[PDB]
Subunit: 283 residues, 2 copies
Amino acid sequence: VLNSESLLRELRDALHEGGLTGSFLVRDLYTGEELGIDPDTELPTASLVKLPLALATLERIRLGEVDGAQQIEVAPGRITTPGPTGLSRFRHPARVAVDDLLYLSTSVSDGTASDALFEITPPAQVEQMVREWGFRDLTVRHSMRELGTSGRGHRVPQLDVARANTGTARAFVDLLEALWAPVLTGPALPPEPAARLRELMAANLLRHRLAPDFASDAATWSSKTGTLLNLRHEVGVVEHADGQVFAVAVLTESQVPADSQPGAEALMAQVARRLRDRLREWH
Amino acid sequence: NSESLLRELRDALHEGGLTGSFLVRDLYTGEELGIDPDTELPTASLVKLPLALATLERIRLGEVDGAQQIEVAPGRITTPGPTGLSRFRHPARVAVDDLLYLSTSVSDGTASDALFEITPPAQVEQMVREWGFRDLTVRHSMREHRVPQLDVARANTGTARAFVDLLEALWAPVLTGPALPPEPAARLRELMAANLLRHRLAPDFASDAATWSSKTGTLLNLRHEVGVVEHADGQVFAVAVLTESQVPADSQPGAEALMAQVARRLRDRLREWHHHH
């Protein structure tokens, strides 16, 4: 059995080997114990931004500022290239309620749905609410279709951490902890919006990244993926049948050009799983 | 030849608590390798494939308007599994073309129910039979043996061969070298390419040098996926996997990896024979 210093070295070696850099953090939501690799490195968040958008929207609903039943006439994305989902691929206008736009945006990763929600609650207003709740290191700057590893001043706007929506693994772990706190027993988001976001994350349809390594008959996995250019992320919470609960955040960028990298997915998933397993084995 | 490979894959399936119908076919050469490819199983969400085809043919004929806006009652489902309109809380208005996307690519049961109101199960089955497809039954919609859904007498059924034959016909218009209407076929290949449920066979078939277009089916202890892999070098294989598990757990990503590995190894053997024999 490896010691934890040796394990982290093995994991970093494995990531380097597979052409991946990024930000990993796993935390036992009960004890606060955690294990990570570069957990405070800021990367563009791609579709992970849909999480704080959902929470802001849900809070505005609780507040009576937004009506979840409000029917919105949404123009089709008409996108025919690979990747975007839901209304983004529609050919014709659709009419969808705000509550159901939240489902499409958060669970189906539908950027056209997300953009409809951003019209209601703009990026700067989402960010303000996130900051007011005390969340640091999550930026919300632009909607889904506004806009050499990522970096400050990047030529590619979506890879420029000064312009793009960004975050760190730690920022997402802190968010997930706050979302799950109302159901964590034993010795501060409003509980109704938190419960609704947990439900949306459980209903996530994109289960091809970390979910094969985290979901089982004895574990539930609720998560949000993000994929754009050479970015592949996923943040989520695994709930074990024995009651253990871990938040997991993976943000990666690949030095391999190919969009389709199932081996990279398997690798980042194995890394996250080994981090969780070490904490789970930890006395 | 491949007797050894087939025993090895049958062993793996037995050990993993899976039985079913597997078939992989090289769409150019016609060579195929299977495990019980003629065994009838309930098809679950796979029925959305013939439904889409039948609908798309009706659009071509002017019988159905892809632009027609449908007012859809929400599924209001909160338990795990169903997707799209099935999980909506409120009514929504969606065009036929976009219900085809939801049903086929998102596996949305409520969207497929709306499509079945337009082109009902027996009409789909009739259209499929008239095109010459056998061993695909279409009897009920999503929201319609001692378990009803596992009863091959009542349920929508199919065999791996049935699906492989359907996939072959859908891809035929783009297969070069020495019959479905091409527009409906093209639209369905596109819907299949846009499938979102990429957690089953997709990790084993999609790569930088291979595209994977498919449809999954999941119900009770049934776990299926049928699809086509297109290699960067021009090879094309149709893949059909229909399984039922003896293990009662709904969540079995090990079973999913197992069935994907079986299908991939069948393809690999055909790909090797194509290249090297």
